[PDB]
Write an enzyme that holds these catalytic residues in place. Structure first.
Site, PDB file in Angstrom:
ATOM      1  N   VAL A   1      78.313  -9.521  56.522  1.00 35.84           N
ATOM      2  CA  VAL A   1      77.451 -10.486  55.877  1.00 35.84           C
ATOM      3  C   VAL A   1      78.348 -11.592  55.367  1.00 35.84           C
ATOM      4  O   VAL A   1      79.536 -11.347  55.139  1.00 35.84           O
ATOM      5  CB  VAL A   1      76.711  -9.856  54.662  1.00 35.84           C
ATOM      6  CG1 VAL A   1      75.609 -10.769  54.125  1.00 35.84           C
ATOM      7  CG2 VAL A   1      76.163  -8.490  55.005  1.00 35.84           C
ATOM      8  N   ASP A   2      77.827 -12.777  55.195  1.00 36.72           N
ATOM      9  CA  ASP A   2      78.633 -13.860  54.632  1.00 36.72           C
ATOM     10  C   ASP A   2      78.762 -13.660  53.142  1.00 36.72           C
ATOM     11  O   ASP A   2      77.756 -13.587  52.451  1.00 36.72           O
ATOM     12  CB  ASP A   2      78.023 -15.254  54.876  1.00 36.72           C
ATOM     13  CG  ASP A   2      77.976 -15.677  56.317  1.00 36.72           C
ATOM     14  OD1 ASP A   2      78.965 -16.249  56.819  1.00 36.72           O
ATOM     15  OD2 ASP A   2      76.931 -15.479  56.976  1.00 36.72           O
ATOM     16  N   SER A   3      79.986 -13.515  52.669  1.00 39.56           N
ATOM     17  CA  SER A   3      80.320 -13.432  51.255  1.00 39.56           C
ATOM     18  C   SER A   3      79.558 -14.437  50.385  1.00 39.56           C
ATOM     19  O   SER A   3      78.946 -14.058  49.385  1.00 39.56           O
ATOM     20  CB  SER A   3      81.799 -13.631  51.085  1.00 39.56           C
ATOM     21  OG  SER A   3      82.099 -13.921  49.702  1.00 39.56           O
TER      22      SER A   3
ATOM     23  N   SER B   1      76.852 -15.909  51.015  1.00 43.86           N
ATOM     24  CA  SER B   1      75.441 -15.628  51.124  1.00 43.86           C
ATOM     25  C   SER B   1      75.095 -14.306  50.423  1.00 43.86           C
ATOM     26  O   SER B   1      73.935 -14.028  50.134  1.00 43.86           O
ATOM     27  CB  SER B   1      75.055 -15.569  52.591  1.00 43.86           C
ATOM     28  OG  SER B   1      75.441 -16.758  53.253  1.00 43.86           O
ATOM     29  N   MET B   2      76.118 -13.514  50.129  1.00 46.97           N
ATOM     30  CA  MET B   2      75.971 -12.228  49.468  1.00 46.97           C
ATOM     31  C   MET B   2      75.397 -12.403  48.102  1.00 46.97           C
ATOM     32  O   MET B   2      74.617 -11.587  47.660  1.00 46.97           O
ATOM     33  CB  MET B   2      77.310 -11.482  49.374  1.00 46.97           C
ATOM     34  CG  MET B   2      77.888 -11.005  50.689  1.00 46.97           C
ATOM     35  SD  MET B   2      77.396  -9.348  51.182  1.00 46.97           S
ATOM     36  CE  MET B   2      75.651  -9.294  50.807  1.00 46.97           C
TER      37      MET B   2
END
Length: 81
Positions: A38-40, A42-43
């Site tokens: 997952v994109d950090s 976006s996390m």
């Protein structure tokens, strides 16, 4: 505000849309960005999405405290109810 079955199921779905994970990978002890991919950045969205969905509240200090969904969920449930 139920339990893990609420959290994980939902949190996975968030990660499905945010990144593009399948709703089976996000179990527990999964390092989100690190395991699932997952994109950090976006996390953070996923966290505020998680807590707003599961009825818990997670501050930014706890957002960065949760490194896996194991953390997250255990935190969430335990803080929901």
């Amino acid at each position: 505000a139920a339990t893990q079955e609420e959290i994980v199921a939902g949190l996975a779905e968030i990660v499905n849309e945010i990144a593009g994970i399948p709703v089976e990978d996000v179990k527990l002890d999964k390092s989100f960005t690190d395991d699932l991919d997952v994109d950090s950045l976006s996390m953070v969205e996923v966290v505020v999405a998680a807590e707003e969905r599961f009825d818990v509240k997670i501050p930014d200090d706890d957002v960065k405290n949760l490194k896996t969904v194991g953390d997250a969920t255990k935190y969430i449930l335990d803080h929901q109810a």
